Design an enzyme around this catalytic site. Structure first.
Site, short mmCIF file in Angstrom:
data_model
loop_
_atom_site.label_atom_id
_atom_site.label_comp_id
_atom_site.label_asym_id
_atom_site.label_seq_id
_atom_site.Cartn_x
_atom_site.Cartn_y
_atom_site.Cartn_z
N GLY A 1 0.56 -1.29 -0.23
CA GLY A 1 0.07 -0.71 -0.06
C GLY A 1 0.63 1.47 0.34
O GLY A 1 1.43 1.99 0.83
N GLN A 2 0.68 1.80 -1.18
CA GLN A 2 1.33 3.19 -1.31
C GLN A 2 -0.12 4.32 -0.78
O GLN A 2 0.40 5.29 0.62
CB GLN A 2 2.26 3.56 -2.70
N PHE A 3 -1.23 3.79 -0.38
CA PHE A 3 -1.96 4.34 -0.60
C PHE A 3 -3.30 3.34 0.44
O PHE A 3 -4.28 4.53 0.73
CB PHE A 3 -3.05 4.93 -1.59
CG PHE A 3 -2.25 6.05 -2.94
CD1 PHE A 3 -0.88 6.05 -2.96
CD2 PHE A 3 -3.08 6.76 -3.02
CE1 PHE A 3 -1.15 6.91 -3.97
CE2 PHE A 3 -2.47 7.70 -4.38
CZ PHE A 3 -1.62 8.39 -4.58
N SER A 4 -2.47 2.27 0.74
CA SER A 4 -3.33 1.98 1.93
C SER A 4 -2.39 1.07 2.42
O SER A 4 -0.84 1.87 2.49
CB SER A 4 -4.47 1.04 0.96
OG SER A 4 -5.19 1.21 0.13
N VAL B 1 -3.64 -2.99 3.88
CA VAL B 1 -4.62 -4.10 4.20
C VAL B 1 -3.70 -4.99 5.22
O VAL B 1 -2.59 -5.25 4.97
CB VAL B 1 -4.51 -4.89 3.35
CG1 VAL B 1 -5.67 -5.93 3.06
CG2 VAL B 1 -5.31 -4.00 1.54
N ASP C 1 -10.25 0.65 -10.74
CA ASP C 1 -8.78 0.57 -10.61
C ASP C 1 -9.63 -1.44 -11.31
O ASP C 1 -8.83 -2.14 -10.02
CB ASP C 1 -8.72 0.12 -9.99
CG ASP C 1 -7.28 -0.09 -9.64
OD1 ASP C 1 -6.77 -1.26 -9.04
OD2 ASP C 1 -6.29 1.01 -10.40
#
Ligand SMILES: CN(C)CCCNS(=O)(=O)c1cccc(Nc2nc(OCC3CCCCC3)c3[nH]cnc3n2)c1
Length: 267
Positions: A25-28, A30, A143
């Site tokens: 994750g660059q944006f996340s 999990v 996406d």
């Protein structure tokens, strides 16, 4: 381990024991987590809206995951809950046991072994019903990439619901900033089917340039597939789903129809 409140179900981080960081994750971020109430295992994406999202972005951002709620279909992951905690926004969804298609394409590229057309339809066909369901209910999976298509131990492919509004598969409309529409999902769906048969994206190269990449996309100059192992119907199908002009790409249903016909033939 903090005070677990069982009355909030899956609406608090106090009812889950995070096992491992199973997400890139660059944006996340999990996580493979387990619930303390009914023991069902789940995934937990830790989005960092915190301050990285303005209030106007937050509002619609949560409005869409509420729409993600409005979808039940075996071939798409299910949305178990969402909530703000620690000012992070946590989203808990179904976890897929087996793994990732992105993690499998590199697996076959690792063994220098291609993917037989027999199976390409075995997985692609499920991914079309899934998308047909989202398109059936006016939802736009924004996406579609190999890193968002996971398979279960059984073999069912679970499509991964993300969203917005470099992406793996870039659209012709998004280069010109014309706007993401339903047929932009047909684009990535095309490039995806290509990647399963070619073991790598359609528009690529050792250059790695950003300019030449899209001048190819609007031109549609991609290395043709080997006709020795992949049917004309396949090579043609993807060739239609990536026609730079959106209006000349097929409806989501047609792609599902073609995928269905040849799944029977290839079995
Ligand atoms: C190397 N292996 C042998 C180790 C065993 C591995 N077992 S494992 O622990 O259960 C395992 C490992 C990886 C994936 C999954 N399944 C899965 N992963 C997600 O996040 C992926 C991430 C999120 C978006 C961008 C980057 C990819 C999910 N998100 C929603 N549902 C998800 N399901 C399970």
């Amino acid at each position: 381990q903090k005070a677990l409140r069982p009355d909030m179900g899956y609406n608090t981080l106090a009812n889950f024991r995070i096992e491992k960081k199973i997400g890139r994750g660059q944006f996340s971020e999990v996580y493979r987590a387990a619930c303390l109430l009914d023991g069902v295992p789940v995934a937990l994406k830790k989005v960092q809206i915190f301050d990285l999202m303005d209030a106007k972005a937050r509002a619609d951002c949560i409005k869409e995951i509420d729409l993600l709620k409005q979808l039940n279909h075996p071939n798409v992951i299910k949305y178990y809950a969402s909530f703000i905690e620690d000012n992070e926004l946590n989203i808990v969804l179904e976890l897929a046991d087996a793994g990732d298609l992105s993690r499998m394409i590199k697996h076959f590229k690792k063994q220098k072994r291609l993917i037989p057309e027999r199976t390409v339809w075995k997985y692609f066909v499920q991914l079309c019903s899934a998308l047909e369901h989202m398109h059936s209910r006016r939802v736009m999976h924004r996406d579609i990439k190999p890193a968002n298509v996971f398979i279960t131990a059984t073999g069912v492919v679970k499509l991964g619901d993300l969203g917005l509004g470099t992406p793996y598969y870039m659209s012709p409309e998004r280069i010109h900033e014309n706007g993401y529409n339903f047929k932009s999902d047909i684009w990535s769906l095309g490039c995806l089917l290509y990647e399963m048969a070619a073991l790598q994206s359609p528009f690529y190269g050792d250059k790695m340039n950003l300019y030449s990449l899209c001048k190819k996309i609007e031109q549609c100059d991609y290395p043709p597939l080997p006709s020795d192992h992949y049917s004309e119907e396949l090579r043609q199908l993807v060739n239609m789903c990536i026609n730079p002009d959106p209006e000349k790409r097929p409806d989501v249903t047609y792609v599902y129809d073609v995928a269905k016909r040849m799944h029977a033939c290839t079995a």
